Amino acid sequence: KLKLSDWFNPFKRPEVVTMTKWKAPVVWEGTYNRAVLDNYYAKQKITVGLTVFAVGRYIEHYLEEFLTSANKHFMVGHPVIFYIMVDDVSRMPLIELGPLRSFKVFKIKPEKRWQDISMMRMKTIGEHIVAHIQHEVDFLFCMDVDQVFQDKFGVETLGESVAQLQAWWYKADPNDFTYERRKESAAYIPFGEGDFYYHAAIFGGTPTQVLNITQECFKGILKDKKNDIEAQWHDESHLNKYFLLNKPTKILSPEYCWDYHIGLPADIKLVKMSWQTKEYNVVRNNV
Numbered sequence: 029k030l031k032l033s034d035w036f037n038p039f040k041r042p043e044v045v046t047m048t049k050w051k052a053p054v055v056w057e058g059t060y061n062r063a064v065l066d067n068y069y070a071k072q073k074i075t076v077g078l079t080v081f082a083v084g085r086y087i088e089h090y091l092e093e094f095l096t097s098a099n100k101h102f103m104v105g106h107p108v109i110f111y112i113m114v115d116d117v118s119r120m121p122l123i124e125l126g127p128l129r130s131f132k133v134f135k136i137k138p139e140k141r142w143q144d145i146s147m148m149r150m151k152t153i154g155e156h157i158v159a160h161i162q163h164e165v166d167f168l169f170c171m172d173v174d175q176v177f178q179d180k181f182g183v184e185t186l187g188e189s190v191a192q193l194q195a196w197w198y199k200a201d202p203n204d205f206t207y208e209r210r211k212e213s214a215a216y217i218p219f220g221e222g223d224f225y226y227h228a229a230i231f232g233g234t235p236t237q238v239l240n241i242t243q244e245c246f247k248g249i250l251k252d253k254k255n256d257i258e259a260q261w262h263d264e265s266h267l268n269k270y271f272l273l274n275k276p277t278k279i280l281s282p283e284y285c286w287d288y289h290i291g292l293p294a295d296i297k298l299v300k301m302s303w304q305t306k307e308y309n310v311v312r313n314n315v
């Protein structure tokens with residue numbers, strides 16, 4: 029089987045956090061041996077999935093740029109399947125795909141509140157895992173559409189359960205993190221607890237693990253509805269509670285999901301994905 033030291037050298041990045049207390053790697057540029065891993069996973073003949081949602085004007089603003097960039101940069105050299113969930117298939121951009129990429133598209137119901145569009149992804153992803161994704165892929169990523177791939181996002185990111193460090197908070201102390209802090213919410217994390225602040229824009233794992241992630245988060249979302257409370261950062265609050273309880277087996281550095289509004293500091297050596305500028309006045313239709 030694969031050993032961590034076969035592909036991961038933390039000493040290449042001595043000035044950042046490269047290992048967690050529960051022995052998961054934090055993958056930074058310089059630490060990974062992609063050649064070793066490409067050879068390993070090609071011998072297993074893996075396929076990698078990617079889900080993305082675009083509901084409303086998120087389709088026109090973001091979906092083409094997301095997919096064009098994913099085609100170029102996501103798991104190059106391996107078969108990939110893009111799963112695209114939209115409310116209006118007639119507005120789908122049908123871009124040309126390259127070798128080892130294919131896709132399929134699903135029509136979904138548009139939830140009335142943007143907060144519920146975001147949170148209902150957890151329910152829909154689990155339904156699709158059970159119905160087909162579990163039979164199609166070895167690993168799955170679930171991503172926001174309001175971002176663009178900038179460089180290779182490869183097999184060094186694969187694992188049983190994979191979390192993303194949020195770009196603005198990776199050096200912060202846990203008591204500064206924007207976790208949900210009301211005990212009445214299923215997402216509550218008390219002061220004095222927490223490892224990292226994870227970004228809900230990227231998470232992944234085997235289909236089995238992603239099913240558990242998404243099912244447990246959606247259970248918390250529904251429980252909160254019954255208690256008349258809505259977590260401060262919606263599905264992200266619940267995801268952070270999940271990963272506190274069920275530690276990820278791999279974490280990605282902020283290089284894998286970077287906000288250029290921060291600037292480009294010394295620690296961010298090669299950006300693999302960048303955030304799109306927010307445009308909520310146009311793309312969201314409720315407060």
Ligand SMILES: CC(=O)N[C@@H]1[C@@H](O)[C@H](O[C@@H]2O[C@H](CO)[C@H](O)[C@H](O)[C@H]2O)[C@@H](CO)O[C@H]1O
Pocket residue numbers: 194196206227228261264306
């Ligand atoms: C240090 C600080 O306050 N930085 C904020 C960012 O947190 C903020 O990003 C939003 O962060 C929330 C969680 O707090 C969530 O992850 C959102 O998806 C994300 O956009 C950013 C927004 O422009 O502003 C900075 O000032």
Ligand SMILES: O=c1ccn([C@@H]2O[C@H](COP(=O)(O)OP(=O)(O)O)[C@@H](O)[C@H]2O)c(=O)[nH]1
Pocket residue numbers: 080081082083084086142143145146171172173174229306311312
């Ligand atoms: O009206 C909506 C609200 C959300 N989304 C999807 O849900 C994700 C999360 O919402 P958003 O990116 O707006 O949250 P932010 O990252 O800005 O906090 C988006 O990237 C889209 O994939 C969408 O398609 N339409």
Ligand SMILES: O=c1ccn([C@@H]2O[C@H](COP(=O)(O)OP(=O)(O)O)[C@@H](O)[C@H]2O)c(=O)[nH]1
Pocket residue numbers: 141144252253254255256257
């Ligand atoms: O139909 C509704 C809308 C809200 N609320 C309660 O507070 C949450 C906020 O509701 P939302 O508008 O987000 O609707 P829902 O997700 O139920 O479609 C709900 O789930 C309910 O528990 C209400 O009692 N009924």
Ligand SMILES: [Mn+2]
Pocket residue numbers: 172173174229
């Ligand atoms: Mn987003």
